[PDB]
mmCIF file of C-alpha atoms and ligand atoms in Angstrom:
data_model
loop_
_atom_site.group_PDB
_atom_site.id
_atom_site.type_symbol
_atom_site.label_atom_id
_atom_site.label_comp_id
_atom_site.label_asym_id
_atom_site.label_seq_id
_atom_site.Cartn_x
_atom_site.Cartn_y
_atom_site.Cartn_z
ATOM 1 C CA UNK R 23 -20.835 -11.145 -7.700
ATOM 2 C CA UNK R 24 -21.695 -7.627 -6.468
ATOM 3 C CA UNK R 25 -19.400 -5.509 -4.294
ATOM 4 C CA UNK R 26 -17.620 -2.421 -5.448
ATOM 5 C CA UNK R 27 -14.572 -3.350 -7.587
ATOM 6 C CA UNK R 28 -11.917 -0.727 -8.421
ATOM 7 C CA UNK R 29 -9.439 -1.890 -11.088
ATOM 8 C CA UNK R 30 -5.725 -1.558 -10.323
ATOM 9 C CA UNK R 31 -3.060 -0.702 -12.890
ATOM 10 C CA UNK R 32 0.560 -1.844 -12.410
ATOM 11 C CA UNK R 33 3.437 0.529 -13.063
ATOM 12 C CA UNK R 34 6.679 -1.289 -13.910
ATOM 13 C CA UNK R 35 6.328 -3.797 -11.071
ATOM 14 C CA UNK R 36 7.118 -0.788 -8.736
ATOM 15 C CA UNK R 37 3.677 0.516 -7.739
ATOM 16 C CA UNK R 38 0.045 0.258 -8.709
ATOM 17 C CA UNK R 39 -2.686 2.857 -8.935
ATOM 18 C CA UNK R 40 -6.481 3.061 -8.990
ATOM 19 C CA UNK R 41 -8.837 5.787 -10.127
ATOM 20 C CA UNK R 42 -11.359 7.685 -8.022
ATOM 21 C CA UNK R 43 -13.291 10.951 -8.353
ATOM 22 C CA UNK R 44 -13.871 13.970 -6.142
ATOM 23 C CA UNK R 45 -16.738 16.450 -6.478
ATOM 24 C CA UNK R 46 -20.260 15.893 -7.689
ATOM 25 C CA UNK R 47 -18.917 16.708 -11.146
ATOM 26 C CA UNK R 48 -16.717 13.599 -10.814
ATOM 27 C CA UNK R 49 -13.294 15.259 -11.192
ATOM 28 C CA UNK R 50 -10.948 12.368 -12.039
ATOM 29 C CA UNK R 51 -7.685 11.449 -10.260
ATOM 30 C CA UNK R 52 -5.265 8.544 -10.124
ATOM 31 C CA UNK R 53 -4.390 7.405 -6.581
ATOM 32 C CA UNK R 54 -1.942 5.317 -4.696
ATOM 33 C CA UNK R 55 -4.225 3.098 -2.562
ATOM 34 C CA UNK R 56 -2.284 2.849 0.680
ATOM 35 C CA UNK R 57 -3.105 0.605 3.630
ATOM 36 C CA UNK R 58 -0.111 2.262 5.366
ATOM 37 C CA UNK R 59 -1.800 5.650 5.677
ATOM 38 C CA UNK R 60 -5.195 6.996 6.604
ATOM 39 C CA UNK R 61 -6.074 10.216 4.853
ATOM 40 C CA UNK R 62 -7.228 11.076 1.383
ATOM 41 C CA UNK R 63 -4.815 13.584 -0.175
ATOM 42 C CA UNK R 64 -5.990 15.434 -3.275
ATOM 43 C CA UNK R 65 -3.974 18.153 -5.070
ATOM 44 C CA UNK R 66 -5.765 21.515 -5.370
ATOM 45 C CA UNK R 67 -6.124 23.885 -8.317
ATOM 46 C CA UNK R 68 -4.811 26.360 -5.730
ATOM 47 C CA UNK R 69 -1.540 24.387 -5.693
ATOM 48 C CA UNK R 70 0.945 26.125 -7.990
ATOM 49 C CA UNK R 71 4.100 24.134 -7.147
ATOM 50 C CA UNK R 72 6.045 22.666 -10.072
ATOM 51 C CA UNK R 73 4.678 19.231 -9.189
ATOM 52 C CA UNK R 74 1.050 20.293 -9.284
ATOM 53 C CA UNK R 75 1.442 21.791 -12.743
ATOM 54 C CA UNK R 76 1.801 18.190 -14.052
ATOM 55 C CA UNK R 77 -1.238 16.726 -12.248
ATOM 56 C CA UNK R 78 -5.042 16.490 -12.307
ATOM 57 C CA UNK R 79 -6.201 19.136 -9.857
ATOM 58 C CA UNK R 80 -9.316 19.465 -7.710
ATOM 59 C CA UNK R 81 -11.449 22.632 -8.074
ATOM 60 C CA UNK R 82 -13.965 22.873 -5.202
ATOM 61 C CA UNK R 83 -15.774 25.755 -6.963
ATOM 62 C CA UNK R 84 -16.958 23.301 -9.641
ATOM 63 C CA UNK R 85 -18.697 20.899 -7.233
ATOM 64 C CA UNK R 86 -22.129 21.676 -5.786
ATOM 65 C CA UNK R 87 -21.496 19.294 -2.858
ATOM 66 C CA UNK R 88 -18.298 20.963 -1.669
ATOM 67 C CA UNK R 89 -18.472 21.824 2.053
ATOM 68 C CA UNK R 90 -15.754 24.175 3.197
ATOM 69 C CA UNK R 91 -13.707 23.186 6.214
ATOM 70 C CA UNK R 92 -10.319 24.928 5.972
ATOM 71 C CA UNK R 93 -8.697 23.313 9.015
ATOM 72 C CA UNK R 94 -4.954 23.508 8.292
ATOM 73 C CA UNK R 95 -2.887 20.367 7.753
ATOM 74 C CA UNK R 96 0.930 20.189 7.817
ATOM 75 C CA UNK R 97 2.744 16.850 7.342
ATOM 76 C CA UNK R 98 6.488 16.074 7.329
ATOM 77 C CA UNK R 99 7.544 13.506 4.724
ATOM 78 C CA UNK R 100 11.262 12.593 4.887
ATOM 79 C CA UNK R 101 12.870 16.052 5.266
ATOM 80 C CA UNK R 102 10.196 18.319 3.760
ATOM 81 C CA UNK R 103 6.657 19.563 4.449
ATOM 82 C CA UNK R 104 3.380 18.888 2.667
ATOM 83 C CA UNK R 105 0.617 21.341 3.463
ATOM 84 C CA UNK R 106 -3.029 21.969 2.764
ATOM 85 C CA UNK R 107 -6.353 22.029 4.564
ATOM 86 C CA UNK R 108 -9.408 19.889 5.077
ATOM 87 C CA UNK R 109 -12.374 19.995 2.674
ATOM 88 C CA UNK R 110 -15.485 17.851 2.402
ATOM 89 C CA UNK R 111 -16.911 16.725 -0.929
ATOM 90 C CA UNK R 112 -18.384 13.740 -2.762
ATOM 91 C CA UNK R 113 -15.806 10.999 -3.178
ATOM 92 C CA UNK R 114 -16.607 8.289 -5.721
ATOM 93 C CA UNK R 115 -14.773 4.989 -5.474
ATOM 94 C CA UNK R 116 -15.918 2.555 -8.132
ATOM 95 C CA UNK R 117 -19.699 2.498 -8.114
ATOM 96 C CA UNK R 118 -20.061 3.903 -4.595
ATOM 97 C CA UNK R 119 -19.942 7.470 -3.432
ATOM 98 C CA UNK R 120 -20.120 9.400 -0.198
ATOM 99 C CA UNK R 121 -19.420 12.874 1.192
ATOM 100 C CA UNK R 122 -15.972 12.609 2.755
ATOM 101 C CA UNK R 123 -13.384 14.735 4.578
ATOM 102 C CA UNK R 124 -10.085 14.863 2.696
ATOM 103 C CA UNK R 125 -6.932 16.977 2.591
ATOM 104 C CA UNK R 126 -6.850 19.490 -0.226
ATOM 105 C CA UNK R 127 -3.124 19.948 -0.918
ATOM 106 C CA UNK R 128 -1.612 23.377 -1.655
ATOM 107 C CA UNK R 129 2.112 22.675 -1.204
ATOM 108 C CA UNK R 130 3.605 19.374 -2.395
ATOM 109 C CA UNK R 131 7.258 20.414 -2.228
ATOM 110 C CA UNK R 132 8.176 18.118 0.677
ATOM 111 C CA UNK R 133 7.078 15.159 -1.470
ATOM 112 C CA UNK R 134 9.570 15.979 -4.232
ATOM 113 C CA UNK R 135 10.954 14.694 -6.411
ATOM 114 C CA UNK R 136 8.832 11.553 -5.832
ATOM 115 C CA UNK R 137 5.566 13.355 -6.668
ATOM 116 C CA UNK R 138 6.719 14.801 -10.017
ATOM 117 C CA UNK R 139 8.537 11.615 -11.040
ATOM 118 C CA UNK R 140 5.402 9.501 -10.629
ATOM 119 C CA UNK R 141 2.131 9.524 -12.584
ATOM 120 C CA UNK R 142 -0.362 9.523 -9.680
ATOM 121 C CA UNK R 143 -2.235 12.596 -8.511
ATOM 122 C CA UNK R 144 -3.045 11.765 -4.918
ATOM 123 C CA UNK R 145 -2.945 9.169 -2.133
ATOM 124 C CA UNK R 146 -6.001 7.415 -0.743
ATOM 125 C CA UNK R 147 -5.322 5.952 2.693
ATOM 126 C CA UNK R 148 -6.949 2.709 3.777
ATOM 127 C CA UNK R 149 -5.582 2.347 7.334
ATOM 128 C CA UNK R 150 -7.372 2.866 10.669
ATOM 129 C CA UNK R 151 -8.907 6.006 12.198
ATOM 130 C CA UNK R 152 -6.098 6.437 14.743
ATOM 131 C CA UNK R 153 -3.491 6.549 11.986
ATOM 132 C CA UNK R 154 -5.259 9.527 10.376
ATOM 133 C CA UNK R 155 -4.698 13.209 10.777
ATOM 134 C CA UNK R 156 -7.888 14.634 12.229
ATOM 135 C CA UNK R 157 -9.478 11.397 13.489
ATOM 136 C CA UNK R 158 -11.320 10.729 10.225
ATOM 137 C CA UNK R 159 -13.301 7.448 9.966
ATOM 138 C CA UNK R 160 -11.936 5.367 7.099
ATOM 139 C CA UNK R 161 -13.854 5.394 3.822
ATOM 140 C CA UNK R 162 -14.910 1.776 4.116
ATOM 141 C CA UNK R 163 -16.094 2.259 7.726
ATOM 142 C CA UNK R 164 -18.175 5.233 6.615
ATOM 143 C CA UNK R 165 -19.658 3.276 3.696
ATOM 144 C CA UNK R 166 -20.790 0.543 6.109
ATOM 145 C CA UNK R 167 -22.281 3.066 8.508
ATOM 146 C CA UNK R 168 -24.469 4.218 5.604
ATOM 147 C CA UNK R 169 -25.616 0.708 4.724
ATOM 148 C CA UNK R 170 -23.919 1.042 1.332
ATOM 149 C CA UNK R 171 -22.114 -2.202 2.077
ATOM 150 C CA UNK R 172 -22.982 -5.009 4.551
ATOM 151 C CA UNK R 173 -19.438 -5.578 5.711
ATOM 152 C CA UNK R 174 -16.747 -3.017 6.470
ATOM 153 C CA UNK R 175 -13.984 -4.844 4.712
ATOM 154 C CA UNK R 176 -11.958 -4.493 1.563
ATOM 155 C CA UNK R 177 -9.694 -6.841 -0.326
ATOM 156 C CA UNK R 178 -6.602 -6.533 -2.512
ATOM 157 C CA UNK R 179 -5.858 -8.690 -5.506
ATOM 158 C CA UNK R 180 -2.746 -6.987 -6.825
ATOM 159 C CA UNK R 181 -1.929 -6.682 -10.508
ATOM 160 C CA UNK R 182 1.156 -8.573 -11.692
ATOM 161 C CA UNK R 183 3.395 -6.954 -14.298
ATOM 162 C CA UNK R 184 3.064 -8.677 -17.707
ATOM 163 C CA UNK R 185 0.552 -11.169 -16.325
ATOM 164 C CA UNK R 186 -2.769 -9.714 -15.163
ATOM 165 C CA UNK R 187 -4.893 -6.893 -13.879
ATOM 166 C CA UNK R 188 -5.739 -6.251 -10.234
ATOM 167 C CA UNK R 189 -8.655 -5.151 -8.049
ATOM 168 C CA UNK R 190 -9.459 -3.382 -4.819
ATOM 169 C CA UNK R 191 -12.841 -4.797 -3.751
ATOM 170 C CA UNK R 192 -14.993 -3.103 -1.151
ATOM 171 C CA UNK R 193 -17.685 -4.880 0.797
ATOM 172 C CA UNK R 194 -17.114 -8.601 0.265
ATOM 173 C CA UNK R 195 -14.654 -11.419 -0.468
ATOM 174 C CA UNK R 196 -14.895 -12.860 -4.021
ATOM 175 C CA UNK R 197 -13.831 -16.440 -4.920
ATOM 176 C CA UNK R 198 -12.348 -15.376 -8.241
ATOM 177 C CA UNK R 199 -9.313 -13.861 -6.499
ATOM 178 C CA UNK R 200 -7.953 -16.675 -4.330
ATOM 179 C CA UNK R 201 -7.432 -20.388 -4.042
ATOM 180 C CA UNK R 202 -7.002 -22.623 -1.058
ATOM 181 C CA UNK R 203 -7.901 -21.601 2.503
ATOM 182 C CA UNK R 204 -8.287 -18.044 3.749
ATOM 183 C CA UNK R 205 -6.716 -17.720 7.189
ATOM 184 C CA UNK R 206 -7.149 -14.787 9.565
ATOM 185 C CA UNK R 207 -4.699 -12.929 11.789
ATOM 186 C CA UNK R 208 -5.872 -10.555 14.543
ATOM 187 C CA UNK R 209 -4.585 -7.013 14.557
ATOM 188 C CA UNK R 210 -2.117 -6.179 17.294
ATOM 189 C CA UNK R 211 -3.117 -2.469 17.033
ATOM 190 C CA UNK R 212 -6.013 -0.655 15.297
ATOM 191 C CA UNK R 213 -3.502 1.591 13.517
ATOM 192 C CA UNK R 214 -1.703 0.040 10.599
ATOM 193 C CA UNK R 215 -2.976 -3.322 9.418
ATOM 194 C CA UNK R 216 -0.404 -4.873 11.697
ATOM 195 C CA UNK R 217 -0.328 -8.497 12.818
ATOM 196 C CA UNK R 218 1.955 -10.728 14.819
ATOM 197 C CA UNK R 219 3.861 -13.448 12.969
ATOM 198 C CA UNK R 220 6.998 -15.500 13.687
ATOM 199 C CA UNK R 221 9.516 -14.559 10.981
ATOM 200 C CA UNK R 222 12.161 -16.976 9.819
ATOM 201 C CA UNK R 223 14.662 -16.768 6.971
ATOM 202 C CA UNK R 224 17.040 -19.721 6.899
ATOM 203 C CA UNK R 225 18.453 -19.910 10.419
ATOM 204 C CA UNK R 226 17.605 -16.309 11.329
ATOM 205 C CA UNK R 227 14.403 -15.826 13.322
ATOM 206 C CA UNK R 228 12.325 -13.232 15.114
ATOM 207 C CA UNK R 229 9.393 -14.642 17.050
ATOM 208 C CA UNK R 230 6.155 -12.685 17.189
ATOM 209 C CA UNK R 231 7.429 -9.949 14.871
ATOM 210 C CA UNK R 232 5.161 -7.029 14.086
ATOM 211 C CA UNK R 233 4.224 -7.384 10.384
ATOM 212 C CA UNK R 234 2.524 -4.541 8.615
ATOM 213 C CA UNK R 235 0.481 -5.390 5.492
ATOM 214 C CA UNK R 236 1.204 -2.345 3.398
ATOM 215 C CA UNK R 237 0.007 -1.761 -0.138
ATOM 216 C CA UNK R 238 1.887 1.579 -0.343
ATOM 217 C CA UNK R 239 5.344 0.108 0.139
ATOM 218 C CA UNK R 240 6.806 -1.571 -2.921
ATOM 219 C CA UNK R 241 9.385 -3.663 -1.035
ATOM 220 C CA UNK R 242 9.610 -6.097 1.844
ATOM 221 C CA UNK R 243 11.289 -4.277 4.735
ATOM 222 C CA UNK R 244 13.268 -6.153 7.354
ATOM 223 C CA UNK R 245 15.045 -5.031 10.560
ATOM 224 C CA UNK R 246 18.615 -4.030 9.636
ATOM 225 C CA UNK R 247 20.486 -6.535 11.800
ATOM 226 C CA UNK R 248 18.158 -9.383 10.704
ATOM 227 C CA UNK R 249 18.794 -8.394 7.074
ATOM 228 C CA UNK R 250 22.575 -8.288 7.571
ATOM 229 C CA UNK R 251 22.543 -11.824 8.989
ATOM 230 C CA UNK R 252 20.221 -13.321 6.388
ATOM 231 C CA UNK R 253 22.315 -11.946 3.497
ATOM 232 C CA UNK R 254 25.553 -13.661 4.588
ATOM 233 C CA UNK R 255 26.760 -15.285 2.485
ATOM 234 C CA UNK R 256 24.563 -15.632 -0.537
ATOM 235 C CA UNK R 257 26.495 -14.167 -3.463
ATOM 236 C CA UNK R 258 24.441 -11.007 -3.029
ATOM 237 C CA UNK R 259 26.162 -7.657 -3.474
ATOM 238 C CA UNK R 260 25.271 -4.266 -2.044
ATOM 239 C CA UNK R 261 25.471 -1.693 -4.820
ATOM 240 C CA UNK R 262 28.202 0.791 -3.832
ATOM 241 C CA UNK R 263 26.683 3.966 -2.303
ATOM 242 C CA UNK R 264 23.112 2.734 -2.855
ATOM 243 C CA UNK R 265 20.756 0.980 -0.429
ATOM 244 C CA UNK R 266 20.105 -1.774 -3.015
ATOM 245 C CA UNK R 267 21.187 -5.403 -3.261
ATOM 246 C CA UNK R 268 21.773 -7.294 -6.484
ATOM 247 C CA UNK R 269 22.283 -10.911 -7.432
ATOM 248 C CA UNK R 270 22.085 -13.305 -10.361
ATOM 249 C CA UNK R 271 18.418 -14.216 -10.933
ATOM 250 C CA UNK R 272 19.161 -17.969 -10.881
ATOM 251 C CA UNK R 273 21.026 -17.671 -7.582
ATOM 252 C CA UNK R 274 20.177 -20.987 -5.910
ATOM 253 C CA UNK R 275 21.311 -19.815 -2.447
ATOM 254 C CA UNK R 276 18.535 -17.212 -2.108
ATOM 255 C CA UNK R 277 16.343 -17.896 0.959
ATOM 256 C CA UNK R 278 12.568 -18.109 1.363
ATOM 257 C CA UNK R 279 10.797 -15.916 3.927
ATOM 258 C CA UNK R 280 8.582 -17.893 6.284
ATOM 259 C CA UNK R 281 5.931 -16.171 8.374
ATOM 260 C CA UNK R 282 3.935 -18.317 10.755
ATOM 261 C CA UNK R 283 1.141 -18.114 13.283
ATOM 262 C CA UNK R 284 -1.195 -20.546 15.002
ATOM 263 C CA UNK R 285 -3.626 -19.795 12.120
ATOM 264 C CA UNK R 286 -1.470 -20.094 9.007
ATOM 265 C CA UNK R 287 1.874 -20.211 7.205
ATOM 266 C CA UNK R 288 2.920 -17.731 4.514
ATOM 267 C CA UNK R 289 6.102 -17.978 2.462
ATOM 268 C CA UNK R 290 7.863 -15.619 0.065
ATOM 269 C CA UNK R 291 10.217 -17.350 -2.345
ATOM 270 C CA UNK R 292 12.924 -15.560 -4.395
ATOM 271 C CA UNK R 293 10.711 -15.440 -7.512
ATOM 272 C CA UNK R 294 8.402 -13.029 -5.624
ATOM 273 C CA UNK R 295 11.058 -10.651 -4.260
ATOM 274 C CA UNK R 296 13.417 -10.503 -7.263
ATOM 275 C CA UNK R 297 13.198 -7.730 -9.863
ATOM 276 C CA UNK R 298 14.915 -8.281 -13.235
ATOM 277 C CA UNK R 299 17.425 -5.568 -14.099
ATOM 278 C CA UNK R 300 18.622 -6.925 -17.468
ATOM 279 C CA UNK R 301 19.675 -3.401 -18.527
ATOM 280 C CA UNK R 302 22.381 -3.334 -15.802
ATOM 281 C CA UNK R 303 23.486 -6.941 -16.342
ATOM 282 C CA UNK R 304 22.620 -10.178 -18.162
ATOM 283 C CA UNK R 305 20.731 -12.391 -15.715
ATOM 284 C CA UNK R 306 20.964 -9.776 -12.955
ATOM 285 C CA UNK R 307 18.208 -9.036 -10.460
ATOM 286 C CA UNK R 308 17.665 -6.584 -7.635
ATOM 287 C CA UNK R 309 16.225 -7.694 -4.292
ATOM 288 C CA UNK R 310 12.935 -5.959 -3.504
ATOM 289 C CA UNK R 311 14.083 -5.886 0.159
ATOM 290 C CA UNK R 312 15.110 -2.863 2.308
ATOM 291 C CA UNK R 313 16.610 -2.706 5.784
ATOM 292 C CA UNK R 314 14.479 -0.585 8.101
ATOM 293 C CA UNK R 315 14.397 -0.307 11.906
ATOM 294 C CA UNK R 316 11.271 0.615 13.849
ATOM 295 C CA UNK R 317 10.894 1.239 17.622
ATOM 296 C CA UNK R 318 9.519 -2.331 17.820
ATOM 297 C CA UNK R 319 10.862 -5.160 15.615
ATOM 298 C CA UNK R 320 8.828 -4.865 12.398
ATOM 299 C CA UNK R 321 8.603 -6.329 8.876
ATOM 300 C CA UNK R 322 6.675 -4.436 6.216
ATOM 301 C CA UNK R 323 4.882 -6.944 4.004
ATOM 302 C CA UNK R 324 4.598 -4.656 1.006
ATOM 303 C CA UNK R 325 3.666 -5.223 -2.603
ATOM 304 C CA UNK R 326 5.958 -8.236 -3.204
ATOM 305 C CA UNK R 327 4.055 -10.115 -0.471
ATOM 306 C CA UNK R 328 0.626 -8.814 -1.557
ATOM 307 C CA UNK R 329 1.261 -9.919 -5.157
ATOM 308 C CA UNK R 330 1.500 -13.512 -3.985
ATOM 309 C CA UNK R 331 -1.190 -13.390 -1.300
ATOM 310 C CA UNK R 332 -4.700 -12.088 -1.737
ATOM 311 C CA UNK R 333 -5.495 -10.020 1.377
ATOM 312 C CA UNK R 334 -8.662 -9.153 3.239
ATOM 313 C CA UNK R 335 -8.776 -6.153 5.562
ATOM 314 C CA UNK R 336 -11.656 -6.450 7.995
ATOM 315 C CA UNK R 337 -12.609 -3.441 10.168
ATOM 316 C CA UNK R 338 -15.516 -5.213 11.809
ATOM 317 C CA UNK R 339 -13.462 -8.136 13.003
ATOM 318 C CA UNK R 340 -10.161 -6.284 13.460
ATOM 319 C CA UNK R 341 -8.277 -8.788 11.338
ATOM 320 C CA UNK R 342 -6.350 -9.476 8.167
ATOM 321 C CA UNK R 343 -7.261 -12.512 6.031
ATOM 322 C CA UNK R 344 -4.652 -14.082 3.771
ATOM 323 C CA UNK R 345 -4.943 -16.631 0.959
ATOM 324 C CA UNK R 346 -2.914 -17.561 -2.097
ATOM 325 C CA UNK R 347 -3.857 -15.203 -4.956
ATOM 326 C CA UNK R 348 -5.085 -16.919 -8.107
ATOM 327 C CA UNK R 349 -2.274 -16.824 -10.643
ATOM 328 C CA UNK R 350 -4.514 -15.547 -13.464
ATOM 329 C CA UNK R 351 -7.866 -13.725 -13.856
HETATM 330 C C1 IH4 S 430 -1.268 15.427 -3.504
HETATM 331 C C2 IH4 S 430 -0.733 14.185 -2.791
HETATM 332 C C3 IH4 S 430 -0.064 14.528 -1.458
HETATM 333 C C4 IH4 S 430 0.490 13.281 -0.784
HETATM 334 C C5 IH4 S 430 1.162 13.599 0.558
HETATM 335 C C6 IH4 S 430 1.782 12.348 1.191
HETATM 336 C C7 IH4 S 430 1.032 11.513 2.004
HETATM 337 C C8 IH4 S 430 1.602 10.381 2.559
HETATM 338 C C9 IH4 S 430 2.929 10.079 2.278
HETATM 339 C C10 IH4 S 430 3.646 8.940 2.979
HETATM 340 O O1 IH4 S 430 4.378 9.188 3.959
HETATM 341 N N1 IH4 S 430 3.479 7.590 2.496
HETATM 342 C C11 IH4 S 430 2.532 7.323 1.421
HETATM 343 C C12 IH4 S 430 3.270 6.960 0.151
HETATM 344 C C13 IH4 S 430 2.891 5.817 -0.535
HETATM 345 C C14 IH4 S 430 3.522 5.439 -1.699
HETATM 346 C C15 IH4 S 430 4.560 6.190 -2.226
HETATM 347 C C16 IH4 S 430 5.220 5.785 -3.466
HETATM 348 C C17 IH4 S 430 5.557 6.719 -4.434
HETATM 349 C C18 IH4 S 430 6.157 6.373 -5.637
HETATM 350 C C19 IH4 S 430 6.456 5.045 -5.887
HETATM 351 C C20 IH4 S 430 7.134 4.634 -7.188
HETATM 352 C C21 IH4 S 430 8.582 5.096 -7.343
HETATM 353 O O2 IH4 S 430 9.506 4.296 -7.171
HETATM 354 O O3 IH4 S 430 8.855 6.336 -7.844
HETATM 355 C C22 IH4 S 430 10.263 6.566 -7.999
HETATM 356 C C23 IH4 S 430 6.118 4.092 -4.934
HETATM 357 C C24 IH4 S 430 5.511 4.460 -3.743
HETATM 358 C C25 IH4 S 430 4.938 7.342 -1.529
HETATM 359 C C26 IH4 S 430 4.312 7.736 -0.366
HETATM 360 C C27 IH4 S 430 4.194 6.545 3.233
HETATM 361 C C28 IH4 S 430 3.307 6.021 4.347
HETATM 362 C C29 IH4 S 430 4.160 5.042 5.183
HETATM 363 N N2 IH4 S 430 4.722 3.972 4.315
HETATM 364 C C30 IH4 S 430 5.793 3.218 5.021
HETATM 365 C C31 IH4 S 430 5.207 2.541 6.243
HETATM 366 N N3 IH4 S 430 5.548 2.976 7.501
HETATM 367 C C32 IH4 S 430 4.881 2.184 8.403
HETATM 368 C C33 IH4 S 430 4.172 1.282 7.689
HETATM 369 N N4 IH4 S 430 4.369 1.473 6.341
HETATM 370 C C34 IH4 S 430 5.464 4.489 3.148
HETATM 371 C C35 IH4 S 430 4.579 5.409 2.316
HETATM 372 C C36 IH4 S 430 3.675 10.895 1.459
HETATM 373 C C37 IH4 S 430 3.103 12.029 0.900
HETATM 374 C C1 IH4 S 431 14.619 -2.553 -2.758
HETATM 375 C C2 IH4 S 431 14.126 -1.189 -3.175
HETATM 376 C C3 IH4 S 431 13.923 -1.120 -4.684
HETATM 377 C C4 IH4 S 431 12.524 -1.599 -5.054
HETATM 378 C C5 IH4 S 431 11.684 -0.499 -5.706
HETATM 379 C C6 IH4 S 431 10.933 0.373 -4.707
HETATM 380 C C7 IH4 S 431 10.226 1.477 -5.182
HETATM 381 C C8 IH4 S 431 9.526 2.286 -4.298
HETATM 382 C C9 IH4 S 431 9.542 1.984 -2.949
HETATM 383 C C10 IH4 S 431 8.564 2.676 -2.014
HETATM 384 O O1 IH4 S 431 7.663 2.025 -1.478
HETATM 385 N N1 IH4 S 431 8.698 4.101 -1.757
HETATM 386 C C11 IH4 S 431 7.678 4.767 -0.941
HETATM 387 C C12 IH4 S 431 8.160 4.870 0.507
HETATM 388 C C13 IH4 S 431 8.644 3.768 1.219
HETATM 389 C C14 IH4 S 431 9.064 3.939 2.537
HETATM 390 C C15 IH4 S 431 8.984 5.187 3.146
HETATM 391 C C16 IH4 S 431 9.433 5.427 4.509
HETATM 392 C C17 IH4 S 431 8.913 6.502 5.218
HETATM 393 C C18 IH4 S 431 9.363 6.772 6.503
HETATM 394 C C19 IH4 S 431 10.325 5.964 7.083
HETATM 395 C C20 IH4 S 431 10.790 6.283 8.499
HETATM 396 C C21 IH4 S 431 10.394 5.178 9.469
HETATM 397 O O2 IH4 S 431 11.266 4.458 9.964
HETATM 398 O O3 IH4 S 431 9.088 5.000 9.805
HETATM 399 C C22 IH4 S 431 8.706 5.745 10.968
HETATM 400 C C23 IH4 S 431 10.858 4.888 6.379
HETATM 401 C C24 IH4 S 431 10.412 4.625 5.089
HETATM 402 C C25 IH4 S 431 8.513 6.270 2.423
HETATM 403 C C26 IH4 S 431 8.088 6.108 1.115
HETATM 404 C C27 IH4 S 431 9.785 4.832 -2.427
HETATM 405 C C28 IH4 S 431 9.253 5.812 -3.472
HETATM 406 C C29 IH4 S 431 10.462 6.402 -4.204
HETATM 407 N N2 IH4 S 431 11.369 7.064 -3.236
HETATM 408 C C30 IH4 S 431 12.643 7.458 -3.864
HETATM 409 C C31 IH4 S 431 12.506 8.342 -5.090
HETATM 410 N N3 IH4 S 431 12.963 8.115 -6.351
HETATM 411 C C32 IH4 S 431 12.589 9.217 -7.071
HETATM 412 C C33 IH4 S 431 11.923 10.095 -6.286
HETATM 413 N N4 IH4 S 431 11.865 9.548 -5.022
HETATM 414 C C34 IH4 S 431 11.798 6.195 -2.117
HETATM 415 C C35 IH4 S 431 10.623 5.560 -1.386
HETATM 416 C C36 IH4 S 431 10.254 0.895 -2.469
HETATM 417 C C37 IH4 S 431 10.946 0.078 -3.345
#
């Protein structure tokens, strides 16, 4: 069915990764594929932090297609800095390749201990140009410009732990991934893949909420006050001194998220946002939900949402398409 298909590997129902190469010698890396960011971040052989010592590292000297840039990049994570500089080289994603401007990372310390604790080497952003450092056209946009695909879109069919594999597909929408109707939502900004949906959980509602479709976030995030209200009183317990909520897995009081527009209706039932934690208690689950406030009222529709719904990210039409993901592949 053509298109460029990059297989996705689940890690513990907490993240997924895909592989891609840098350099015309095809130096291999494992990446977070993140619609919530917009640069390609690749750890350098010149990075000698503790974290880098555990990773696959990029050596520009070994690629004939390396084009030096050297423009310095500094990014703040939560309370630390990540630094490096721009480089241009051949980036291979699936069966497609192109010269591309990425950030060669020298200091990863601001991303600790997350970086060392995880098995990925880098992060490949899939957001919009304006979200990027350095105003870099997204990979898929650049592929289209070069007539390597006919449509500047990509799709996510997420892997499901203990059930099936997943795919990032560039260039077209394949029937094998979804069932029922695909419905489209226009972007409210060309920044994140952010759309406007009415959010309702039980009797709590936020009309025309900003909803960010975000493959790099493993939870659903909800405004803090909204979350407080929806969680009363459901036999859910905040874990003392931790930002986590736990509950019995068969808890019949647990609500379903409802997100609606004039174009479609999307729901997220407890089975999709509950994570079994049998090791901490028989029949106990954690809620894959985090309270988070943004300057405008925002939900992040992260991996729990994307596991249920196949998603289409269309640069040409400035829209997100959503359909029920096929249960098996
Ligand atoms: C050599 C590699 C250098 C990489 C440098 C770098 C670049 C970008 C970020 C960043 O900030 N991100 C991207 C990000 C994406 C995913 C993760 C991540 C990491 C690990 C795990 C699994 C885990 O639980 O480990 C304990 C799950 C997710 C971490 C960060 C965030 C982008 C914004 N979203 C949240 C968001 N905000 C608005 C919309 N969505 C969260 C991830 C962090 C570091
Ligand atoms: C209900 C929660 C339990 C479900 C499991 C789970 C696992 C991983 C995650 C996850 O997407 N990340 C990546 C991430 C998610 C969100 C952010 C983020 C970044 C910035 C902001 C600030 C803001 O408000 O935006 C402007 C708010 C949030 C940054 C990174 C996490 C990666 C791991 N680190 C913690 C860690 N453990 C070990 C090392 N680091 C936290 C973020 C979320 C949930």
